[PDB]
Design a protein around this ligand. Structure first.
Ligand code: ADP
Ligand code: ADP
Ligand code: ADP
Ligand code: MG
Ligand code: MG
Ligand code: MG
Lengths: 529, 523, 525
């Protein structure tokens, strides 16, 4: 009697390296513990006082950021329930662009409180019922917590004040500069129609100087050089070709069949005369700049130099398309001269040297266009990548405001008001659902708690102050990070605001992820290949 | 090292080799001894391909097991031989061969020479053949009831016994439709022209033999009809695509119009092929090779339904069923080559797959048995049982002589041989009488697998077979009692039992002649 | 043993050992799958060797995903796979009834009864149960309400209740749309597209088509209102000659002429399309959308954009038929003589970008005999789960239409069939009455497991239900919220007659064959 044998049935028929977990203890509680560990890995990065993390992935690439979704992507999350919470966070990133850390924090809190409720004696079904009804109540409530609205997205000061909050959590020290830049870019590329595309905001990261030397450019920048002798143009007449800058050849095998010394003597002269004719037709359309998506031939380059045309070679097709959008041109698959409509224009096209890097700039002078570039300067590539992520946050906030212009107070004010109202709803709801409603409410407290802990103050006093002020009636009051002691202030009057849609989607996705993790009861992992 | 033969060359010789061969053979026998009769039990074999074979068939079992003893190899080979020749008796042969070797072990231990034993065995085999042919009875193969009873007496020992009437009628219909004569040569080819398609799901009671064929195919283009009530059918071995030439047909273009002219020439070639087809006014076109989309266009314009890439065997069955003739050059297409005789072409969804039926044929010389059931394994066993049933029907239609089952034939032959042995005065009387009593193993095994008393029942049966008109008396494998086969109805084909006895006796002869095993040597 | 004397590395389970092995594996599978049964069942999470997640309550998916290497388990997995391929539902119940038949038969075989006698009783009970099933089946006019009850009974077992209330209407409307009176339902004509952006309750039925690709030319419109749809299977890209050709020229001018000429063949088809477009749309009022099963090179894309045509390339061979049934045109493999009668109409065509993917919606068709279910959800595993659930629901409604009958659920038919078998037992000759009793006690595993999963006492619940069915004769089952008997036909809990019949047949057959196995053998070495 010195060995316990596998029980007859599934335990014996299970494969060698496979695992099977069943029940509250082996499955539910272990999943909740994993999600809790995940939320703890990302909690200290939440908010303006949130700290950065230095993640090294399996490829030894370095990420310095406090962006939750980025940290999650670069982590090797291997527990399946944590993977599910990460999927929720990435869905938040896809739908909204900001709020991934809210999703993580809130999901982890819901799951911890769900474990506590299961221990006190509620069933996963009742917990899920209460969580769903409380998410519905939160969605019913949030529209009433909306405090302000944008009222204009063509301005540059209002848009900066609106994007500052989203670009403050990331890059707290320097946020007025970044909000100015991102507002300039967003309103440059904002068309008279209410549709806004975030891919039309381009970001060029050039080593050298620092974040205060960054700038916006109404146009495009390419870390390229020019193929020919011309480097500058002041009234660009750009002609864009998706084809190479070479003589067209057959898609079927072509052979030069010579049968006479005369044909042999004349073939190459005829080729160059053909090239000269092609490029001269292009130059005579007025084009002073040619942009080819393919290669350039030496003879064609020769004749472009002869006829004073700036030649640019863009390897990428997305780059070619975006340049076409920028200049108002059409990519021609043939080397035929462009018509007056197929041509593009720029107030200037020139080659410059930003730092060590050489760049070709298609710059409009007008304060508008279809594409704008943000040239990010910085002393480190990692710093510039973090600032690009902050730019992405600001741009996605602008898009969220184009979709829905409503705003809720930040710094935990909406979360505290939600917690209060949902607690008041659970106190009226009889039956075992009230426990889960009240825990769903208490989960919101995790947001101001995380903000306070990262601010460097006592979260319990901060939360007590917030509850007291929201009981006295102020729904726009949240915590003040610019205070060494626990403090609170009017989030609206301070200008710290979140997006109604951001909160909506974050709450929905966090609740759905928690509820799925709870709905799991048995786990049958396979042998890790 | 100075060897004469290579190391790894191991040579055994003598009575150790003889007894080893006999034990290996009788071990092969004990493996499947319980798989004989109506009350047998299934065995679940595990293939090297992760598969499973749940069966009662001796040859299936022995073919799925692997051995290294050459005597066991020979026994597995004779099971294969019985299956290929008659398609029944695959375990009767194994058991009889094992018993013959067992009784020969005695005489070999008693200093008798294997050639003496073998000559006695051959005498006994000739006399067995004589006795079977004397006790056999004829059959009116036009009597469908007699034929169905013959097929039932062969499938009762198999899993399909629960659906005996269904399976019997299926097998009889399939074989009677595959019966074919051309140029004075009768041919029942139930291997090329009676096809079993197993579609899991459904219920076995809806399994049927079609008056036509079935393939797993859909129309090439969904604008084509899926239901046609008098289809004129054309079969092709050639691609309706434009393929290259056998020679180095390289082209050389210098003019502008030539490229387009060449591509249009390809299109015109497809048009001309399709017109060579349309000129016969078919409804369906079935190809073993591809059909280009332009060819599909032209056929659809002609209101023709096409099926693209069928197997040669399926095409041959469609030929036999609908009365068509496979062609390879639509220019050489004739009305005699067009297929009239099919009564309905349907393409219906069975589950989530599209199956093409060419059923309702008149005088179809080919068929498809559509099996439906719980799983591929159950249907594999049903298919094997149906192979048994059809092979028995075939053996009867070829040689209409019947012999009684339940061991009645074995006991009659054993009695006749014992009666003939009393005139034998030499030393072979003993092995001769021994194989006679070694035929008794069939009723012995039947009684054992039924669960009755072998001693008492076999004694009563051996005594019954000493009376005059009792050569039909045998045993039930279902109750453990002696009955008249004239009253029970278990009648085996004389061809089957002849092949069984012959294979058994010759396998015994081979393993008796064998001595002095050698091994190791590499080809 | 015998086999091990010839093949020394051979594995063998004998008469007692093979039955124990098979029954043990069957009961192990039954123990795993018992929890899947019913809407109160539990969802299992399944993690591949790569780390992929599956959330499922489906018996077949669970079987194929569990990590098992047992021969009996393979047999039962295959029977369940056939159940799923033919009926779409019944896999969990299949496994449960198989396990319970084997267990109830072992109950009598351990006391020395022969498995042959148990299987004879199985055959008698199968006959009587099929009779009783045909008797209790409800032949009903398949109205939208009945079909909704059926699809609900399936989707509520497979997913959450609110998502089930959405998928129910989606599935029922899709089937009621692609179905022609007295014409077998081709489920291929219901496309199933997954989008990974919104909530799971956004899953909808598009009365049209959704292609998982869009136009590859940027100047092509992203929205078309009154669109002529051209469904084609004609290459619009450069085609090389079958026979090896090659170009031979003596001058760059000749090379240029050959470059212009080599495309004339496909330019001609582009012009045919463009001329049809001009003849049917004399202005920019209506729209023209080409949907090609084959490729379209950039030159052709430019030529069609210039004329205002939206061209999608490399569509699906099934989308050819789906588009001709939704829009109403003719799918073409050649433009030899194309006419406006070859075109379909869609009252709206537009494009939807989702990250790196594009979608094309073709909606506002007149009476589309082909539709699509757009599975929206926040996670890949949510989408997979809803795909499985909608498969089940589509099969359920299709089966309810095919079988104009419908059978009460909640273990009602099993309770009633058990009572009928027990009343039939005396008419059975010999100790096959014990096989009949085993069949009945096996049929009773469905209500038992339903109670076990709702959190009730199996014996108490079953006694209540059997008492109500004997006193009243009404077909009563388990109420999963009170544990009391309830009339399934009155509360709208329906099962598929085909599913129940397939269960009876296949379970009886596989259980019989397993009970009659007397040797498991691996000797292929
Ligand atoms: N100046 C500020 N004072 C207080 N809270 C702030 C301030 N700026 C941002 N926040 C809060 O930080 C939270 C978001 O921080 P972040 O780390 O970006 O999380 P998420 O990834 O969820 O957007 C929000 O609750 C927001 O209100
Ligand atoms: N109802 C029956 N009663 C007694 N013997 C039977 C019965 N049916 C068939 N048999 C006998 O069983 C033998 C066939 O058994 P089977 O398992 O088919 O072995 P095989 O066909 O490989 O010889 C024959 O001797 C046949 O006469
Ligand atoms: N609302 C309900 N109340 C009671 N029983 C139900 C209900 N819905 C479904 N059932 C029953 O639960 C059983 C199992 O469902 P499920 O596991 O999805 O079927 P399967 O066994 O075919 O996989 C079915 O027999 C069904 O009749
Ligand atoms: Mg943020
Ligand atoms: Mg046989
Ligand atoms: Mg179901």
């Amino acid at each position: 009697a010195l060995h316990v044998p596998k029980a007859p049935g599934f335990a014996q028929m299970l494969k060698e390296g496979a695992k099977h977990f069943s029940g509250l203890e082996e499955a539910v509680y272990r999943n909740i513990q994993a999600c809790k560990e995940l939320a703890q890995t990302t909690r200290t990065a939440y908010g303006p006082n949130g700290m950065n993390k230095m993640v090294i992935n399996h490829l030894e690439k370095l990420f310095v950021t406090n962006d939750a979704a980025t940290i999650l992507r670069e982590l090797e999350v291997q527990h399946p329930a944590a993977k599910m919470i990460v999927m929720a966070s990435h869905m938040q990133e896809q739908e909204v662009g900001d709020g991934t850390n809210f999703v993580l924090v809130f999901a982890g809190a819901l799951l911890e409180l769900a474990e506590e409720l299961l221990r006190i004696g509620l069933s996963v079904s009742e917990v899920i019922e209460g969580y769903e009804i409380a998410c519905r109540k939160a969605h019913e409530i949030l529209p009433n917590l909306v405090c302000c609205s944008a009222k204009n997205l063509r301005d540059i000061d209002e848009v900066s004040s609106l994007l500052r909050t989203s670009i403050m959590s990331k890059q707290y020290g320097n946020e007025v500069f970044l909000a100015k830049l991102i507002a300039q870019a967003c309103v440059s590329i904002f068309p008279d129609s209410g549709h806004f595309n975030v891919d039309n905001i381009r970001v060029c990261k050039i080593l050298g100087s620092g974040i205060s030397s960054s700038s916006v450019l109404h146009g495009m920048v390419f870390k390229k050089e020019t193929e020919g002798d011309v480097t500058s143009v002041k009234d660009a007449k750009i002609a864009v070709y998706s084809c190479p800058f070479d003589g067209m050849i057959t898609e079927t095998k072509g052979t030069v069949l010579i049968k006479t010394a005369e044909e042999l003597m004349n073939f190459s002269k005829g080729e160059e005369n053909l090239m000269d004719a092609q490029v001269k037709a292009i130059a005579d359309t007025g084009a002073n700049v040619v942009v080819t998506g393919g290669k350039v031939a030496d003879m064609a380059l020769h004749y472009a130099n002869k006829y004073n045309i700036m030649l640019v070679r863009l390897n990428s097709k997305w780059d070619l398309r975006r340049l076409c959008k920028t200049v108002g041109a059409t990519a021609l698959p043939r080397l035929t001269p462009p018509v007056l409509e197929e041509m593009g224009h720029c107030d200037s096209v020139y080659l410059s040297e930003v730092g060590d890097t050489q760049v070709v700039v298609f710059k409009h002078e007008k304060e508008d266009g279809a594409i704008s570039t943000i040239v990010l300067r910085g002393s480190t590539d990692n710093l510039m990548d973090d600032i690009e992520r902050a730019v992405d946050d600001g741009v996605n906030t602008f898009k969220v405001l184009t979709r829905d212009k409503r705003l809720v107070p930040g710094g935990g004010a909406t979360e505290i008001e939600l917690a209060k109202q949902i607690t008041s709803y659970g106190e009226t709801c009889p039956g075992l659902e009230q426990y889960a409603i009240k825990k769903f409410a208490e989960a919101f407290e995790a947001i101001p708690r995380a903000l306070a802990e990262n601010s460097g103050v006592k979260a319990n006093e901060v939360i007590s102050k917030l509850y007291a002020v929201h009981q006295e009636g102020n729904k726009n009051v949240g915590l003040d990070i610019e205070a060494e002691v626990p403090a609170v202030k009017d989030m609206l009057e301070a200008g710290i605001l979140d997006t109604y849609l951001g909160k909506y989607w974050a709450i929905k996705l966090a609740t759905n992820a928690a509820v799925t993790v709870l709905r799991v009861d048995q786990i049958i992992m396979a042998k890790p290949a | 090292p100075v060897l004469v033969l290579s190391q790894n060359t191991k040579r055994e010789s003598g009575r150790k080799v003889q007894s080893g061969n006999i034990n290996a053979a009788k071990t092969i026998a004990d493996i499947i001894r319980t798989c004989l009769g109506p009350k047998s039990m299934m065995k679940m074999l595990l293939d090297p391909m992760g598969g499973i074979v749940m069966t009662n068939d001796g040859n299936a079992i022995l073919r799925e097991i692997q051995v290294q003893h050459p005597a066991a190899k020979s026994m597995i080979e004779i099971s294969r031989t019985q299956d290929e020749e008659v398609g029944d008796g695959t375990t009767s042969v194994i058991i009889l061969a094992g018993e013959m070797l067992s009784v020969a072990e005695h005489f070999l231990e008693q200093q008798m020479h294997p050639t003496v034993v073998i000559s006695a065995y051959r005498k006994a085999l000739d006399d067995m053949i004589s006795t079977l042919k004397k006790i056999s009875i004829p059959v009116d193969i036009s009597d469908s009831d007699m034929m169905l009873n013959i097929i039932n007496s062969s499938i009762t020992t198999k899993a399909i016994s629960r659906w005996s009437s269904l399976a019997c009628n299926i097998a009889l219909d399939a074989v009677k439709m595959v019966q074919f004569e051309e140029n004075g040569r009768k041919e029942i080819d139930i291997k090329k022209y009676a096809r079993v398609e197993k579609i899991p799901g459904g219920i076995i009671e809806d399994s049927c033999v079609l008056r036509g064929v079935m393939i797993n195919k859909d129309v090439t283009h969904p604008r084509m009809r899926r239901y046609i009530k008098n289809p004129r059918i054309v079969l092709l071995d050639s691609s309706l695509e434009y393929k290259k030439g056998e020679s180095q047909t390289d082209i050389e273009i210098t003019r502008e119009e030539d490229f387009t002219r060449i591509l249009q020439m390809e299109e015109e070639y497809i048009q001309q092929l399709c017109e060579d087809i349309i000129q016969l006014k078919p409804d369906v076109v079935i190809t073993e090779k591809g059909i280009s989309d332009l060819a599909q266009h032209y056929l659809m314009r002609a209101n023709i339904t096409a099926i693209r890439r069928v197997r040669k065997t399926d095409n041959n069955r469609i030929a036999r069923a609908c009365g068509a003739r496979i062609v390879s050059r639509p220019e050489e297409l004739r009305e005699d080559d067009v297929g009239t005789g099919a009564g309905l072409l349907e393409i219906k969804k069975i589950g989530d797959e599209y199956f093409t039926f060419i059923t309702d044929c008149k005088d179809p010389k080919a068929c498809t048995i559509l099996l439906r059931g719980a799983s591929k394994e159950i249907l594999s066993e049903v298919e094997r049982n149906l192979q048994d049933a059809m092979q028995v029907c075939r053996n009867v239609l070829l040689d209409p002589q019947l012999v009684p089952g339940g061991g009645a034939s074995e006991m009659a032959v054993a009695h006749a041989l014992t009666e003939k042995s009393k005139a034998m005065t030499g030393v072979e009387q003993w092995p001769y009488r021994a194989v006679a009593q070694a035929l008794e193993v069939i009723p012995r095994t039947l009684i054992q697998n039924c669960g009755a008393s072998t001693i008492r029942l076999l004694t009563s049966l051996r005594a019954k077979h000493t009376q005059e008109n009792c050569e039909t008396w045998g045993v039930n494998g279902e109750t453990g009692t002696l009955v008249d086969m004239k009253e029970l109805g278990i009648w085996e084909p004389l061809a089957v039992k002849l092949q069984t006895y012959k294979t058994a006796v010759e396998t015994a002869v081979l393993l008796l002649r064998i001595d002095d095993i050698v091994s190791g040597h590499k080809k | 043993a015998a086999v091990k004397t010839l093949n020394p590395k051979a594995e063998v389970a004998r008469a007692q050992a093979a039955l124990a092995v098979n029954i043990s594996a069957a009961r192990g599978l039954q123990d795993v799958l018992r929890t899947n049964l019913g809407p109160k069942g539990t969802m299992k999470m399944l993690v591949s060797g790569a780390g992929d997640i599956k959330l499922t309550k489906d018996g077949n998916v669970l079987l194929h995903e569990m990590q098992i290497q047992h021969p009996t388990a393979s047999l039962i997995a295959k029977v369940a796979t056939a159940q799923d391929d033919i009926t779409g539902d019944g896999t969990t119940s299949n496994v449960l009834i198989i396990g319970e038949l084997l267990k109830q038969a072992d109950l009598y075989i351990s006391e020395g009864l022969h498995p042959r006698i148990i299987t004879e009783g199985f055959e008698a009970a199968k006959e009587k149960a099929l009779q009783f099933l045909e008797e209790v089946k409800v032949s009903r006019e398949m109205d939208r309400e009945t079909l909704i009850d059926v699809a609900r009974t399936s989707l509520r077992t497979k997913v959450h209740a609110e998502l089930a209330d959405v998928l129910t209407e989606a599935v029922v409307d899709s089937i009621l749309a692609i179905k022609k009176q007295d014409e077998p339902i081709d489920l291929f004509m219901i496309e199933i597209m997954e989008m990974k952006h919104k909530s799971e309750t956004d899953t909808s039925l598009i009365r049209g088509l959704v292609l998982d690709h869009g136009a590859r030319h940027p100047d092509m419109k992203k929205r078309v209102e009154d669109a002529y749809i051209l469904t084609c299977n004609v290459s619009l890209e450069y085609e090389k000659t079958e026979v090896n050709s090659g170009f031979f020229y003596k001058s760059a001018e000749e090379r240029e002429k050959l470059v212009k000429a080599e495309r004339k063949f496909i330019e001609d088809r582009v012009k045919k399309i463009i001329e049809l477009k001009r003849k049917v749309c004399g202005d920019s009022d209506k729209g023209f959308v080409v949907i090609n099963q084959k490729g379209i090179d950039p030159f052709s894309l430019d030529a069609l954009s210039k004329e205002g045509i939206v061209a999608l390339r490399r569509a699906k061979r099934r989308n050819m038929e789906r588009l001709t049934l939704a829009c109403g045109g003719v799918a073409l493999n050649s433009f030899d003589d194309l006419s406006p009668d070859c075109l379909g109409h869609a009252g709206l065509v537009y494009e939807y970008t989702l990250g790196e993917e594009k979608f094309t919606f073709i909606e506002k068709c007149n009476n589309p005999r082909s539709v699509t279910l757009l599975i929206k959800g926040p996670n890949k595993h949510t989408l997979t789960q809803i795909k499985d659930a909608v498969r089940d629901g589509l099969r359920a409604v299709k089966n309810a239409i095919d079988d104009g009958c419908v059978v009460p659920g909640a273990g009602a038919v099993e309770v009633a069939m058990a009572e009928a078998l027990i009343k039939h037992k005396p008419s059975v000759k010999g100790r096959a009455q014990l096989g009949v009793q085993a069949f009945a006690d096996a049929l009773l595993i469905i209500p038992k497991v339903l109670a076990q999963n709702s959190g009730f006492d199996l014996q108490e619940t079953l006694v209540k239900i059997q008492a109500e069915h004997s006193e009243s004769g009404q077909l009563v089952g388990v109420d999963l919220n009170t544990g009391e008997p309830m009339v399934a036909a009155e509360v709208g809990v329906w099962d598929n007659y085909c599913v129940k019949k397939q269960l009876l047949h296949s379970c009886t057959v596989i259980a019989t064959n397993i009970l009659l196995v007397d040797e498991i053998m691996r000797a292929g070495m």
